[PDB]
Coordinates of C-alpha atoms and ligand atoms in Angstrom, one line a residue:
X1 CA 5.7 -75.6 16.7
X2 CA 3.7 -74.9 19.7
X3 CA 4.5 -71.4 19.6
X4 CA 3.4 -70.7 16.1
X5 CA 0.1 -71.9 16.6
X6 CA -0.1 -70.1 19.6
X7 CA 1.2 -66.9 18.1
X8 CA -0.7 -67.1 15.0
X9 CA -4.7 -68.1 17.0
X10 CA -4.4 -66.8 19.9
X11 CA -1.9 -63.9 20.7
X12 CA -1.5 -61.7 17.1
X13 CA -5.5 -61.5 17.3
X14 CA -5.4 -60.9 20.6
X15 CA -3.0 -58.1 20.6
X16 CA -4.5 -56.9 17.4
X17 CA -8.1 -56.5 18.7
X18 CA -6.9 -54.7 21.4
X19 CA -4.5 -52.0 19.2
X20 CA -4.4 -50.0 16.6
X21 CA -2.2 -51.2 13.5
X22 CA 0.4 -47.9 14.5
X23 CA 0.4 -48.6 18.1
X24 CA 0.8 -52.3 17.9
X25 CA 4.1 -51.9 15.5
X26 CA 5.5 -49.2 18.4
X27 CA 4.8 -51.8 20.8
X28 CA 6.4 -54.4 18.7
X29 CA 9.7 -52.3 18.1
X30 CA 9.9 -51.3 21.6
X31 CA 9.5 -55.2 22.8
X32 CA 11.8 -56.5 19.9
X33 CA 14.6 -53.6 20.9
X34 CA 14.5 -55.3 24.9
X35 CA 15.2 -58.5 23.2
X36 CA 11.5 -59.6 24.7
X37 CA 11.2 -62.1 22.0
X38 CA 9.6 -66.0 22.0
X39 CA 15.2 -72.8 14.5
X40 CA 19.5 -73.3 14.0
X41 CA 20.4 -71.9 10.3
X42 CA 22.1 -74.8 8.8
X43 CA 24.9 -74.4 5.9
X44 CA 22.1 -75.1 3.1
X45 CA 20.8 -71.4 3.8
X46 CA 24.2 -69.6 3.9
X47 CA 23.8 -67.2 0.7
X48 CA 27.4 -65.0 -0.7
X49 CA 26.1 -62.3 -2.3
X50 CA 26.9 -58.2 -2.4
X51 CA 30.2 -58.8 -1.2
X52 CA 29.2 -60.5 1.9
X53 CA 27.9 -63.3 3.7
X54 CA 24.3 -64.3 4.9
X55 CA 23.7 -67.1 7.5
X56 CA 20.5 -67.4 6.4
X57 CA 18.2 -65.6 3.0
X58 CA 15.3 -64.3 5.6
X59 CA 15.5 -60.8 6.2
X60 CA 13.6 -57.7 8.1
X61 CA 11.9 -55.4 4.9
X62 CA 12.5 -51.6 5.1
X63 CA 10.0 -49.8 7.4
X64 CA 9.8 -52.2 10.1
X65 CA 12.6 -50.5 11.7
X66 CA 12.6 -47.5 10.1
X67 CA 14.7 -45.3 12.7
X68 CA 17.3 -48.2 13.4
X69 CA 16.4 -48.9 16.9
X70 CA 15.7 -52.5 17.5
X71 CA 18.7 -54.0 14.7
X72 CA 20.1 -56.6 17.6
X73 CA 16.7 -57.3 18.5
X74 CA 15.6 -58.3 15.1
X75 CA 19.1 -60.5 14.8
X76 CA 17.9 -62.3 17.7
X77 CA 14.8 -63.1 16.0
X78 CA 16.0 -64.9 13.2
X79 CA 16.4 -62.7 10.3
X80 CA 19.4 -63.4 8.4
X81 CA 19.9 -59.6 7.5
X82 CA 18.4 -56.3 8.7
X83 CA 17.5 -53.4 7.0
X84 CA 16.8 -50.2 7.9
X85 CA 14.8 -47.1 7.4
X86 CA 13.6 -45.3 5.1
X87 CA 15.5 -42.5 6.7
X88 CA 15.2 -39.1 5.2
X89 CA 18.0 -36.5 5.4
X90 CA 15.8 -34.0 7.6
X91 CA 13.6 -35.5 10.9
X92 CA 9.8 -35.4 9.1
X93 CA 6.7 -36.3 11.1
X94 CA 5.0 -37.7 7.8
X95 CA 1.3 -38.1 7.2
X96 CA -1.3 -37.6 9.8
X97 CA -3.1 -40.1 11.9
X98 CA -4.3 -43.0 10.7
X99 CA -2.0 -43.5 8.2
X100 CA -1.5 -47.5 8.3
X101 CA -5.0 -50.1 8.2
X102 CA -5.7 -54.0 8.4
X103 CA -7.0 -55.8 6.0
X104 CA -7.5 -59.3 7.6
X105 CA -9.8 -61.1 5.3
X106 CA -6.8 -60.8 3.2
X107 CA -4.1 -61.3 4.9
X108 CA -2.7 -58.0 3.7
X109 CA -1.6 -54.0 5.1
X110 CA -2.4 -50.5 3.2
X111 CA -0.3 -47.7 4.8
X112 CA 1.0 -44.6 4.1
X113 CA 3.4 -43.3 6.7
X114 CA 4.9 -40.7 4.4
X115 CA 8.5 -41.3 5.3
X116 CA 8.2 -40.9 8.7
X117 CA 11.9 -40.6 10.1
X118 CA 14.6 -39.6 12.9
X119 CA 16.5 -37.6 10.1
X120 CA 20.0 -38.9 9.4
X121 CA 21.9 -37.1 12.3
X122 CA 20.2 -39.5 14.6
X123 CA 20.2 -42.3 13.0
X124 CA 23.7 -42.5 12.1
X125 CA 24.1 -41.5 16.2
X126 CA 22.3 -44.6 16.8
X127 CA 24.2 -46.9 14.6
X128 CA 27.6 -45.5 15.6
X129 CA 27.2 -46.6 19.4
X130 CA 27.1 -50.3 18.1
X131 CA 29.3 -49.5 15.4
X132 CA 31.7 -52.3 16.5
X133 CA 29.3 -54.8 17.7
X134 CA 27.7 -54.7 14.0
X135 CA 31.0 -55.0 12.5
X136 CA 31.6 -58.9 14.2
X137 CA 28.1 -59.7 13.2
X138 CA 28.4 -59.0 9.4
X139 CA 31.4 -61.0 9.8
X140 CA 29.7 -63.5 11.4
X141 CA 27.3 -63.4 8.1
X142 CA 24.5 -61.0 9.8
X143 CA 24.5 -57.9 6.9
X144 CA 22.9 -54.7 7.9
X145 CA 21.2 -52.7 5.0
X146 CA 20.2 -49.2 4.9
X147 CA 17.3 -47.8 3.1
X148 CA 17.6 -44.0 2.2
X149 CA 15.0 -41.7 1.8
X150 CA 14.2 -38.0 1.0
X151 CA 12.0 -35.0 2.5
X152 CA 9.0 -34.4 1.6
X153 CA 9.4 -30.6 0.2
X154 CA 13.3 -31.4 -1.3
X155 CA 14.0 -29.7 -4.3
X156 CA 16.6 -31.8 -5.6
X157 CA 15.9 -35.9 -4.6
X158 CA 19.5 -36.9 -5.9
X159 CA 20.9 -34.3 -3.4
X160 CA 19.2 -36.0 -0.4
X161 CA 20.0 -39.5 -1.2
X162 CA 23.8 -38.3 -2.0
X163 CA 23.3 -36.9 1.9
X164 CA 22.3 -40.2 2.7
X165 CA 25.0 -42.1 1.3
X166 CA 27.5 -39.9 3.2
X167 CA 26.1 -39.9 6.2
X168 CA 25.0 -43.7 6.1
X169 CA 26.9 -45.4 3.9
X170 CA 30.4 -45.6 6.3
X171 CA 27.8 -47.8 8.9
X172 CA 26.2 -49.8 6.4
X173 CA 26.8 -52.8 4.4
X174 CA 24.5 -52.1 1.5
X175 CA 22.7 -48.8 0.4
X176 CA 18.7 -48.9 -1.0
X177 CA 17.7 -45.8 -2.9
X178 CA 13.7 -46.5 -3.6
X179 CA 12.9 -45.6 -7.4
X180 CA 13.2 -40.0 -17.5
X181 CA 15.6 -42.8 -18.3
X182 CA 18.1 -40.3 -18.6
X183 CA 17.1 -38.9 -15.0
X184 CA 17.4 -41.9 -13.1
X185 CA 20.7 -42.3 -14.9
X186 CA 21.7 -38.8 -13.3
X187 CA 20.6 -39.8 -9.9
X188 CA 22.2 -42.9 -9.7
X189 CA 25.4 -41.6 -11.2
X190 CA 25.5 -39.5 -8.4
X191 CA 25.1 -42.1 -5.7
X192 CA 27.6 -44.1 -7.1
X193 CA 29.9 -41.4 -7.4
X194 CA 29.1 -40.5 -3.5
X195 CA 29.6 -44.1 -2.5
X196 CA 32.9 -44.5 -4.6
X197 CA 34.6 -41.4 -2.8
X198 CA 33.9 -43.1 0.6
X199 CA 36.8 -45.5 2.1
X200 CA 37.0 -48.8 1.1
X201 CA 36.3 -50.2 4.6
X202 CA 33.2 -48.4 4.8
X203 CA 32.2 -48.7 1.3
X204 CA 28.9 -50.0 0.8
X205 CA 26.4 -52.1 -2.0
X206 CA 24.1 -49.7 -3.6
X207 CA 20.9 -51.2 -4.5
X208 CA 17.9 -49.7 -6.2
X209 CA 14.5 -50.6 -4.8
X210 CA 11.4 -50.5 -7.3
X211 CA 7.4 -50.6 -7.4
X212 CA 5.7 -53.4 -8.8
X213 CA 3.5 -50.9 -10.2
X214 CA 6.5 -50.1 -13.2
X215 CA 5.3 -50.3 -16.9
X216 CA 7.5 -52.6 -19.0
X217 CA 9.0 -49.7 -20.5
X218 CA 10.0 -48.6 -17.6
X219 CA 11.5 -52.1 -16.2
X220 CA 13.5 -52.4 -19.9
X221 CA 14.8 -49.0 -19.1
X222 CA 15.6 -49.6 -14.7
X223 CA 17.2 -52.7 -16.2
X224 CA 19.9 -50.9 -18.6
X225 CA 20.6 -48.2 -16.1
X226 CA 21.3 -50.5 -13.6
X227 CA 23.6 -53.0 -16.1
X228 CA 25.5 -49.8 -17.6
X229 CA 26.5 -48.0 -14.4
X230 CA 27.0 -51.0 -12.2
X231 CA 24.4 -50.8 -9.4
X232 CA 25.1 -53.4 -7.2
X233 CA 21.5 -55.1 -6.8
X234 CA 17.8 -54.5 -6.9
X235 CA 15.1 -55.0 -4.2
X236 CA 11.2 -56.3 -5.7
X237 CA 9.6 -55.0 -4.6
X238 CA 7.9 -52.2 -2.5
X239 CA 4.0 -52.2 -1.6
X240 CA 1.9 -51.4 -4.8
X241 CA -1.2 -48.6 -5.6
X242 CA -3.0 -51.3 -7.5
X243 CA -5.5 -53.1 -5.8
X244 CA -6.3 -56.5 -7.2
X245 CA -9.9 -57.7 -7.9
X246 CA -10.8 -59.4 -4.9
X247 CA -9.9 -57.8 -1.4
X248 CA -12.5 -58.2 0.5
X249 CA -11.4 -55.7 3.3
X250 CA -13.9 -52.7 4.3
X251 CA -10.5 -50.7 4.5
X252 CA -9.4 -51.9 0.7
X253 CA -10.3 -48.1 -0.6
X254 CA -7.7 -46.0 1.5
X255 CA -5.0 -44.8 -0.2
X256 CA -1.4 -46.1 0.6
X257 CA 0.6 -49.1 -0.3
X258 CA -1.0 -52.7 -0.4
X259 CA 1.4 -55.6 1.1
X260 CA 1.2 -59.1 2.3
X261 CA -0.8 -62.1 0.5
X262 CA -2.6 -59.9 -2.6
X263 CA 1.1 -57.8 -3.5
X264 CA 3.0 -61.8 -3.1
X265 CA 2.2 -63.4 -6.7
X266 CA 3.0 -59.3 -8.6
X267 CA 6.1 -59.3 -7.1
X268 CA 7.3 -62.7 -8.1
X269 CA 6.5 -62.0 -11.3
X270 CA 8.2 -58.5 -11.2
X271 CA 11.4 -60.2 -9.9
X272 CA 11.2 -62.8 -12.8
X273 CA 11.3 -59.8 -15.3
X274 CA 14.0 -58.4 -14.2
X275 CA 16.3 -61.2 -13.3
X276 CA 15.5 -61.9 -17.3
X277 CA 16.1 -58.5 -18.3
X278 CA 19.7 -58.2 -16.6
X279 CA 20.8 -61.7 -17.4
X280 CA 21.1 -62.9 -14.0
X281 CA 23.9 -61.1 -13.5
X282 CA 22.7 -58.1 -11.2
X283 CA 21.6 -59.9 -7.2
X284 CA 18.0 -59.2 -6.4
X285 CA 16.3 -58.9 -3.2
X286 CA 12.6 -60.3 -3.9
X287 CA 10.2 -59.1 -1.6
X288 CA 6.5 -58.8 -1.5
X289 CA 3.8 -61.5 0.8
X290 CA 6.3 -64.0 1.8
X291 CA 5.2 -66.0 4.3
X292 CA 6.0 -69.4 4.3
X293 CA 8.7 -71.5 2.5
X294 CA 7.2 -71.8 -0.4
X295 CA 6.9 -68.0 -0.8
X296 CA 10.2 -67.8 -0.2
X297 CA 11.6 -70.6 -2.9
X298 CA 9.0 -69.3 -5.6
X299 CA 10.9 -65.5 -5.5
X300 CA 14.2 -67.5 -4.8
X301 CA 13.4 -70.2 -8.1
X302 CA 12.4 -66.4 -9.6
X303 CA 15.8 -64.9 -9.7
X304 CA 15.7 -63.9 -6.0
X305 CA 19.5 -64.5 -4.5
X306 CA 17.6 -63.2 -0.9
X307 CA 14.4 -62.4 0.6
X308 CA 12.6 -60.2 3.1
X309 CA 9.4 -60.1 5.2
X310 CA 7.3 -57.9 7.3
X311 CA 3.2 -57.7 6.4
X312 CA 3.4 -61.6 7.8
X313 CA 5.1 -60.7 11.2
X314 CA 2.2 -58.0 11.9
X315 CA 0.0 -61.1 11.7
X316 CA 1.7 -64.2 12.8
X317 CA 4.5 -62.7 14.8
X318 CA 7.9 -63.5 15.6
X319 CA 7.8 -66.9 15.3
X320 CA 6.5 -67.0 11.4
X321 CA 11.0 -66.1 10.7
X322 CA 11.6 -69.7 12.4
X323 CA 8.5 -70.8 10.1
X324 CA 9.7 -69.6 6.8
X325 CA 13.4 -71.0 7.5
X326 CA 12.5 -74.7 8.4
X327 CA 9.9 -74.8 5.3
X328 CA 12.7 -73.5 2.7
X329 CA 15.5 -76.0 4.3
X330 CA 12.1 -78.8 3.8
X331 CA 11.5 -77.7 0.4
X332 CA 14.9 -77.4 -0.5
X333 CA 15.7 -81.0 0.1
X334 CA 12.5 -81.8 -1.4
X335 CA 13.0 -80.8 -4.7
X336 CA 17.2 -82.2 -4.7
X337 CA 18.8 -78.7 -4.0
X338 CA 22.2 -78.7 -2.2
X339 CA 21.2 -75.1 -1.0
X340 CA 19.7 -71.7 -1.5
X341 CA 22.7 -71.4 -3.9
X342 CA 21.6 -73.9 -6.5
X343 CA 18.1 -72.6 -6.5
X344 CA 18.5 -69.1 -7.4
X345 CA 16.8 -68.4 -11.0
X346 CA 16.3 -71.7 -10.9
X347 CA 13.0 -71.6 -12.9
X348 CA 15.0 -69.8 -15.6
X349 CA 16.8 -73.0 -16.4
X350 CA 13.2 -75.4 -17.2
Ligands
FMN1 C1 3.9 -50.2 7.5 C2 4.9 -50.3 6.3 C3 5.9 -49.3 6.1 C4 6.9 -49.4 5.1 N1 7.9 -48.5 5.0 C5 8.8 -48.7 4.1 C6 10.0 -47.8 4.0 O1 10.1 -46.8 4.9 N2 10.9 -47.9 3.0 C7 10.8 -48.9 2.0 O2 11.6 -49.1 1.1 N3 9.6 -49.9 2.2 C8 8.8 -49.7 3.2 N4 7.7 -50.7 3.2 C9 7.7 -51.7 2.1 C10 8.3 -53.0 2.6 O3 9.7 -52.9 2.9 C11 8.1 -54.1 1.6 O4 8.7 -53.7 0.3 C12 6.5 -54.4 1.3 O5 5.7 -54.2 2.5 C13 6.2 -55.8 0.8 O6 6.7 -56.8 1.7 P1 5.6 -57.6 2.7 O7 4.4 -57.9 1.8 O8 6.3 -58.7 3.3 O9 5.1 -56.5 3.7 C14 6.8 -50.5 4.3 C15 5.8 -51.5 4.4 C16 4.9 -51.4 5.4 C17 3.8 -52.5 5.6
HYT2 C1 0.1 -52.9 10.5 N1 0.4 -53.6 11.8 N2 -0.5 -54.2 12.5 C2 0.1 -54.8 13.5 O1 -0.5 -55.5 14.5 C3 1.5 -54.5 13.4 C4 2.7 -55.0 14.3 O2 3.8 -54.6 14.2 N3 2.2 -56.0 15.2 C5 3.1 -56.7 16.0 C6 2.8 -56.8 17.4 F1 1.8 -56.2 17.8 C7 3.7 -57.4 18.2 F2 3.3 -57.4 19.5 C8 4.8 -58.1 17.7 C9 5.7 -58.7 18.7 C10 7.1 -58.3 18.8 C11 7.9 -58.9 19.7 C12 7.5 -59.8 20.6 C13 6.2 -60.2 20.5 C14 5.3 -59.7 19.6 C15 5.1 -58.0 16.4 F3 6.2 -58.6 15.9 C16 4.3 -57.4 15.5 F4 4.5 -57.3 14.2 N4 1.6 -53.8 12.3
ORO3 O1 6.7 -44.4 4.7 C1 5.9 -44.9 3.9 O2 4.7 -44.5 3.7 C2 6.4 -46.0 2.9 C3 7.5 -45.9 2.3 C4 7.8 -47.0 1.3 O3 8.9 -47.0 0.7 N1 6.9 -48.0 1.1 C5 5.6 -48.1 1.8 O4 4.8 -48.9 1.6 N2 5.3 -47.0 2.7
CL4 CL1 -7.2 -51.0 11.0
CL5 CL1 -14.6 -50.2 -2.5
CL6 CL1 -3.2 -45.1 -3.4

């Protein structure tokens, strides 16, 4: 479309050479939470997964809204499913200033935020006044996730995501907690326990969200924690601390996690491991430099039931969610699926 173009040439660059990466995404969550926003999701894209129903498999990544304050917003722009956060028990003010940098040469973000958050108490606050309003659109197959975090100086981690699950979990339908063996069996025991005690209308999916930066060790091990206790799902993956031979960016030494183009083809690859390793049987979120259809299909052909975005909308803007839908229905067709449906782990099947 005309507005893609227009978006992706003229405005984004625009906008970014006048702001600051932190600035601009303020600006873009106050103008996204006013509904001040520039496709028609067809039955091929309709995914059933975590007990639920998504209109479409495009959704908003954790940390794009991490305080919960522009969810109907983001609904109007497309995204299939929101989710929210991280949000950490406690308010925290996280790391100093500058703490998120562009790398445009290649297409890619480095940030470290530091779990920057509202605290629970306001957040839950938040979601309760549209409580109701989010219960018609899950219904009407728009899901809202919540991503749960801890503070910075807890002592015990499991404590603050079991906070989380209490506090969170009745408004939400699914749960993230971001992730030896034996203690992330402990942790995750206890989440589940937490969400299990909560009532069954307000019972949420609990998924565990992982770094492609994981040993294969430790992906054999996340694998048969997750089969053994019954976690829900997995999300793959978060930014990573490696940085790939390459980046040309004068900003590709900070510290902080890398996203966008450079992190895509790690975490496809980290979502085919561990759709392997749990036998297709445990849904996965694949995440990581999608920004186009064929990003999308690759993680979905890669064991990926959905997906989610957010380095591409800091460069191409809203429109790119309208972009990555009408390439996947293309591609879809293209290559004689019926749907998402047929194409999940499809590569498995070659
Ligand atoms: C500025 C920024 C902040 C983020 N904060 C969060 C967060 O609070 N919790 C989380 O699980 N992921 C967070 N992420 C990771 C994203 O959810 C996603 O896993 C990662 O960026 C890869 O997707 P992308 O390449 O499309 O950006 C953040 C990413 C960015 C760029
Ligand atoms: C690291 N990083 N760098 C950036 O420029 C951003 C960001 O969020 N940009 C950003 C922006 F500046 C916008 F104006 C919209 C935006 C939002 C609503 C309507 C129009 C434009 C946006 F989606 C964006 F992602 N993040
Ligand atoms: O807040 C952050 O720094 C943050 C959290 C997270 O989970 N991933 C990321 O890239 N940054
Ligand atoms: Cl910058
Ligand atoms: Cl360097
Ligand atoms: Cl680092």
């Amino acid at each position: 479309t005309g507005d893609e173009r227009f978006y992706a040439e003229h405005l984004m660059p625009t906008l970014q050479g006048l702001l600051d990466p932190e600035s601009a995404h303020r600006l873009a969550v106050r103008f996204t939470s006013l509904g001040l926003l520039p496709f028609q999701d067809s039955d091929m894209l309709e995914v059933r997964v975590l007990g639920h129903k998504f209109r479409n498999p495009v959704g908003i990544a954790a940390g794009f809204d991490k305080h919960g304050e522009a969810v109907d917003g983001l609904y109007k722009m497309g995204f299939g499913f929101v989710e929210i956060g991280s949000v950490t028990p406690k308010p925290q003010e996280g790391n100093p200033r500058p703490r998120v940098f562009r790398l445009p040469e290649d297409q890619a973000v480095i940030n470290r935020y530091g779990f920057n958050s509202h605290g629970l108490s306001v957040v839950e606050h938040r979601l309760r006044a549209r409580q109701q309003k989010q219960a018609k659109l899950t219904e009407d197959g728009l899901p809202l996730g919540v991503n749960l975090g801890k503070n910075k100086t807890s002592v015990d981690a499991a404590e603050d995501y079991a906070e989380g699950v209490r506090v969170l979990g009745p408004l939400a339908d699914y749960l993230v907690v971001n992730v030896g063996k034996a203690e992330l069996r402990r942790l995750l025991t206890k989440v589940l326990q937490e969400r299990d005690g909560l009532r069954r209308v307000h019972r949420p999916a609990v998924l565990v969200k992982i770094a492609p930066d994981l040993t294969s060790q430790d992906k054999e091990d996340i694998a048969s924690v997750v089969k053994e206790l019954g976690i829900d799902g997995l999300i793959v993956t978060n930014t990573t601390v490696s940085r790939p031979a390459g980046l040309q960016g004068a900003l590709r030494s900070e510290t902080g996690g890398l996203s966008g183009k450079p992190l895509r083809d790690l975490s496809t690859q980290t979502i085919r491991e561990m759709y392997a390793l749990t036998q297709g049987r445990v849904p996965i979120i694949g995440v990581g430099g999608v920004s186009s259809g064929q990003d999308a299909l690759e993680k979905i052909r890669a064991g990926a039931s959905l997906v989610q975005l957010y380095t591409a909308l800091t460069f191409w803007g809203p429109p790119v969610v309208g972009k990555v839908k009408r390439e996947l229905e293309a591609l879809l067709k293209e290559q004689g699926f019926g749907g998402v449906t047929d194409a999940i782990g499809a590569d498995h099947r070659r």
